[PDB]
Amino acid sequence: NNYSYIDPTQLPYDHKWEFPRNRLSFGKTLGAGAFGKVVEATAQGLIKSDAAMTVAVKMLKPSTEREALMSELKVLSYLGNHENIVNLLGACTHGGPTLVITEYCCYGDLLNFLRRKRDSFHENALDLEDLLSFSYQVAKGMAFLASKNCIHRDLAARNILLTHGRITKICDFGLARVIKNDSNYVDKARLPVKWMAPESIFNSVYTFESDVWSYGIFLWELFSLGSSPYPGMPVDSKFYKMIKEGFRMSSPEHAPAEMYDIMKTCWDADPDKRPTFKQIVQDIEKQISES
Numbered sequence: 001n002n003y004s005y006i007d008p009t010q011l012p013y014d015h016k017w018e019f020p021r022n023r024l025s026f027g028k029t030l031g032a033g034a035f036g037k038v039v040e041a042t043a044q045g046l047i048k049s050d051a052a053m054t055v056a057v058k059m060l061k062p063s064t065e066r067e068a069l070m071s072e073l074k075v076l077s078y079l080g081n082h083e084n085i086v087n088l089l090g091a092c093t094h095g096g097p098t099l100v101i102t103e104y105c106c107y108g109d110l111l112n113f114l115r116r117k118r119d120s121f122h123e124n125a126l127d128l129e130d131l132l133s134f135s136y137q138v139a140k141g142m143a144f145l146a147s148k149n150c151i152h153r154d155l156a157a158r159n160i161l162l163t164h165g166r167i168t169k170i171c172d173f174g175l176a177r178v179i180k181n182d183s184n185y186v187d188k189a190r191l192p193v194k195w196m197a198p199e200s201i202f203n204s205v206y207t208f209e210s211d212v213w214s215y216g217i218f219l220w221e222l223f224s225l226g227s228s229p230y231p232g233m234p235v236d237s238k239f240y241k242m243i244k245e246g247f248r249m250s251s252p253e254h255a256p257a258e259m260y261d262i263m264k265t266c267w268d269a270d271p272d273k274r275p276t277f278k279q280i281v282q283d284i285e286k287q288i289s290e291s
């Protein structure tokens with residue numbers, strides 16, 4: 001067909017984000033692993049008052065990773081500002097290695113935060129109300145992504161950062177896609193198998209419902225205070241068979257029955273059966289009201 005919905009992520013990079021490399025001062029390395037490394041930095045000229053502020057810069061080492069950073073930057077540029085997404089401040093794409101500048105989140109990733117706070121569980125401590133809040137905020141951020149026809153494809157506790165105010169922000173949009181034109185997205189690198197829906201493993205298809213499956217696994221990490229999914233189970237032929245057979249993880253220790261009910265429905269083999277992020281948001285909001 002000669003008519004198509006236009007994908008903003010495919011459009012050329014908008015230079016409104018362009019930031020001079022000279023105005024950045026790199027500090028210590030905040031993280032490594034999946035996509036390059038993130039370094040804390042000081043940026044000047046971002047404020048209307050010309051003050052300097054602390055920012056996080058994502059970069060790669062010196063070619064799928066090169067495009068994934070550019071893809072993440074464009075997805076963020078299209079998404080816009082949201083409370084529950086890591087916010088894009090600027091980018092450096094001229095005269096050097098590509099740099100993506102985002103807001104700095106003090107607490108770091110949610111997975112490491114829940115492990116650090118596991119012993120303390122139940123003023124700086126963690127309790128069940130924090131876990132419900134985390135569930136709700138991430139659901140809100142996800143429901144926002146869906147409203148923009150966007151799929152994260154890598155939702156997990158490691159990809160949620162905690163900022164001041166006990167606010168959670170989703171990050172790491174390198175695998176994220178916009179599926180407006182087609183209802184299903186088909187991929188042809190390394191993937192987070194423990195977080196993937198079955199149709200995504202077996203048939204390589206990603207949808208809004210595959211993002212919901214990943215959300216359910218996230219809830220399992222959340223209410224087990226940062227435990228690894230499918231504990232002690234390597235990714236092998238036995239694991240794939242059990243998932244196809246319908247074997248799911250059991251309820252984490254701290255999770256309320258109602259929250260486990262949501263995990264189960266996120267894990268339904270049939271994508272149509274799974275709830276939407278809009279419905280999850282509603283469900284969690286009613287559960288919080290009962291307190």
Ligand SMILES: Cc1[nH]nc(C(=O)Nc2cnc3[nH]c(-c4ccccc4)cc3c2)c1C
Pocket residue numbers: 030031038056057058072073086100101102103104105106107108109161171172173
């Ligand atoms: C493009 C893009 N997508 N996603 C990020 C991202 O991940 N940005 C971002 C923000 N704030 C952070 N704080 C920390 C941290 C805090 C305390 C201790 C250790 C680490 C890491 C980190 C990363 C970026 C950039």
